[PDB]
Symmetry: C2
Subunit: 212 residues, 2 copies
């Protein structure tokens, strides 16, 4: 029931280092081509006093190009959907955790999202908005305990060159019971194409292709 | 001074969970094509009572295909060479550490290697030789503190399907002073093409291509 063009609707409630915030978002993409884009406005918490970049990767692996020879765990899970939970460890001690429950409403995906970030040093790159972008990545996906795990080593580039390392660990739980895939990879590039002064409005893209 | 075909000569002294061992090895490869193969015989410690797989990734990123648009940190470092140090953390608590100093002797690379593994549960996949192979990987390389770091998430497949997760963290120190590269990746596939009953003799291949 996956369609060539589908839309996205999402809200995130969160808090980073004690500062609460709420973001909502609208966008669309092509599930079979692995491309997507979305617009995101801050509803509460504005202006955010931390790097927006830490949030962007939380903003649905259904939007990945999956070759025929690989089982699409995500596209199979619909219309019932699936959820995922992710830990995010930054080398300077900051931790972020996030869940997203994903449901289908016609042709438009709905994300319910929760986000908690903490232990970011005050003088760190996240608290001082010194991040620039996520470098591209390759996520490693493998089956464990009947669900689907996703691990990836991430790096934010910083002001002056230089990189800020984060490790993502993700678990994907399909609602219904779906066919499980062998070990494979998903390349990612995520970009903020544009934004206003304090990232209250943000336009975000990500293309992703699975392979072996 | 890098040549189309070059040879490898290597010795490793080590110990895993208290059991000492020594391995030597001869092989060759094509630096510019990222392919290599080697033969490895156990000299002391035979037969090894642990998974051979934990060793194989220690057995020279000069053997990677580097496109023109990317700085080859390794190929630049010669004939003086370079060394590297790697931590290897397995999810079941076992840790391995390893260094390799790499020198050129004519057309043949020489590896001096040290290896320490410990804290592997007795009933674990490494102590019970239940590993099958390393899944392919994508290593993320970035510059830090004037040297070159290399991080990669690895998985050993196991008996019965299922996977054993390890995180590699590697630092590469060139001897001389060489040009430093931007963030990039190196895909790896490493295979034991053949071996005798107890892995005393082993034939090992790895192809690797850098990209962006």
């Amino acid at each position: 029931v996956i369609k060539p063009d589908m839309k996205i609707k999402l809200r995130m409630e969160g808090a980073v280092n004690g500062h609460p915030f709420a973001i909502e978002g609208v966008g669309l993409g092509k599930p079979f081509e692995g491309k997507q884009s979305m617009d995101l406005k801050v509803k509460e918490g504005g202006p955010l006093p931390f790097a927006y970049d830490i949030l962007t990767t939380v903003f649905n692996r259904v939007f990945a190009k999956y070759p025929e020879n690989i089982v699409d765990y995500f596209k199979q899970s619909f219309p019932e959907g699936y959820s995922w939970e992710r830990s995010m460890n930054y080398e300077d001690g900051g931790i972020c955790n996030a869940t997203n429950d994903i449901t289908l409403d016609g042709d438009c995906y709905i994300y319910e999202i929760r986000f908690r970030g903490t232990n970011f040093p005050a003088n760190g790159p996240v608290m001082q908005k010194r991040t620039v972008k996520w470098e591209p990545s390759t996520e490693n996906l493998y089956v464990r305990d009947g669900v689907l795990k996703g691990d990836v080593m991430m790096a934010l580039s910083l002001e002056g060159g230089g990189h800020y390392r984060c490790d993502f660990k993700t678990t994907y739980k399909a609602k219904k019971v779906v066919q499980l895939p062998d070990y494979h990879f998903v390349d990612h590039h995520i970009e903020i194409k544009s934004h206003d002064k304090d990232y209250s409005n943000v336009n975000l893209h990500e293309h992703a292709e699975a392979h072996s």
